[PDB]
Design a protein around this ligand. Sequence first.
Ligand code: HEM
Ligand SMILES: *[C@@H]1O[C@H](CO)[C@@H](O)[C@H](O)[C@H]1NC(C)=O
Ligand SMILES: *[C@@H]1O[C@H](CO)[C@@H](O)[C@H](O)[C@H]1NC(C)=O
Ligand SMILES: *[C@@H]1O[C@H](CO)[C@@H](O)[C@H](O)[C@H]1NC(C)=O
Ligand SMILES: *[C@@H]1O[C@H](CO)[C@@H](O)[C@H](O)[C@H]1NC(C)=O
Ligand SMILES: *[C@@H]1O[C@H](CO)[C@@H](O)[C@H](O)[C@H]1NC(C)=O
Ligand SMILES: COc1cccc(OC)c1O
Ligand SMILES: [Cl-]
Ligand SMILES: [Mg+2]
Length: 327
Amino acid sequence: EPGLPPGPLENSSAKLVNDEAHPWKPLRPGDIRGPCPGLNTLASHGYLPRNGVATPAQIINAVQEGFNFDNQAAIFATYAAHLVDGNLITDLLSIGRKTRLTGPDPPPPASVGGLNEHGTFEGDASMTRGDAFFGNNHDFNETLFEQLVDYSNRFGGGKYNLTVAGELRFKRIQDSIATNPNFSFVDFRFFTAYGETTFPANLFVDGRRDDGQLDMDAARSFFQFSRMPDDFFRAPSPRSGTGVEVVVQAHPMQPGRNVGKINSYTVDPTSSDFSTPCLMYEKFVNITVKSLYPNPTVQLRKALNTNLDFLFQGVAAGCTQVFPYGR
Ligand code: HEM
Ligand SMILES: *[C@@H]1O[C@H](CO)[C@@H](O)[C@H](O)[C@H]1NC(C)=O
Ligand SMILES: *[C@@H]1O[C@H](CO)[C@@H](O)[C@H](O)[C@H]1NC(C)=O
Ligand SMILES: *[C@@H]1O[C@H](CO)[C@@H](O)[C@H](O)[C@H]1NC(C)=O
Ligand SMILES: *[C@@H]1O[C@H](CO)[C@@H](O)[C@H](O)[C@H]1NC(C)=O
Ligand SMILES: *[C@@H]1O[C@H](CO)[C@@H](O)[C@H](O)[C@H]1NC(C)=O
Ligand SMILES: COc1cccc(OC)c1O
Ligand SMILES: [Cl-]
Ligand SMILES: [Mg+2]
């Protein structure tokens, strides 16, 4: 019932992806878009179902076909998101808000809240979306985008590149520390917050150039309108987070959180960090997934174990698989 994770592209060359079969269309009533401009764009070009509800296999195929996201990264992200935000029985995940379209819900404490669910996959210090504490963690924010433009002007000669990513990533962390008393920057979010800042440079840059310099017209088109530029070619090879080391090196940070007040950022020594990637995977499964499904019934336990096996396919070589519900 859960389909097998798709394999890598047979042909990963750059090609036109804004093509006749995948035109941009505006939203219809009920169409769901969320905090990810990549998935949003794929839905708005029909690489995913246009209503924003999809299976993990549909998501993996879409990120590969439309943007040349690499297979390992696609698998890890998709199954992580599905485990914490999707319906494991129906095999459906919303790319934004919680919806009845993902089917009959499992029992509490599982939320099946879609990608909009705060603190599962989605988290604080996003580039163009506000922190959940401020009321909306999913819609495009013009003020935040204008700051991205400003940082691109200051550090990228008017373009978004890895140097800009390094500076903006830090600025957003510092702004959340100063204003969000509930700011959390540990474990899974600590990792994804860095990786996501490379994606516009690696994946939104036309693949015929692949120069890591994203122009602001293209940036707005993706971030605000979920729309590929006219004649957009995808990247010329599979990739996801390459160059994340540049972003980290610009302003190395420890994982931590504000402790109920602004300007109280307190390092968490129980968090994983970039020195312990396997711990990030182990805590995600043992703590995050397990807490949503502490004592699942038979069909849920089976679906959990299958999706956990799929998640492990995307885990970097050298980590040991963990089994929260037995073998
Ligand atoms: C493979 C499955 C994917 C999933 C499940 C996924 C999910 C998400 C989620 C939940 C966020 C919000 C994190 C946060 O800021 O709090 C996010 C951010 C982001 N995603 Fe993805 N994503 C995926 C692939 C991609 C791809 C292929 C691209 C580009 C082609 C992309 C581009 C981005 C960008 C740029 C952000 C940051 C948005 C911002 O901070 O303003 N994603 N994604
Ligand atoms: C792979 O796709 C590219 C772009 O569409 C094309 O030029 C190339 O010849 C394809 N390779 C094969 C083996 O068909
Ligand atoms: C506040 O932080 C906790 C995690 O420490 C999280 O469970 C909760 O959803 C957060 N809420 C908002 C609006 O940030
Ligand atoms: C956008 O972000 C700014 C800056 O953090 C915030 O003040 C504003 O309330 C957000 N929302 C909108 C709708 O502009
Ligand atoms: C970003 O652009 C600026 C200005 O062109 C340049 O100095 C810097 O080296 C660029 N960084 C990257 C990683 O391309
Ligand atoms: C996760 O649970 C497994 C037992 O299934 C255990 O071996 C492992 O040490 C745990 N890891 C963490 C980080 O809790
Ligand atoms: C490969 O890593 C990732 C995959 C999907 C989303 C991410 O950031 C939100 C991310 O950092
Ligand atoms: Cl790949
Ligand atoms: Mg966020």
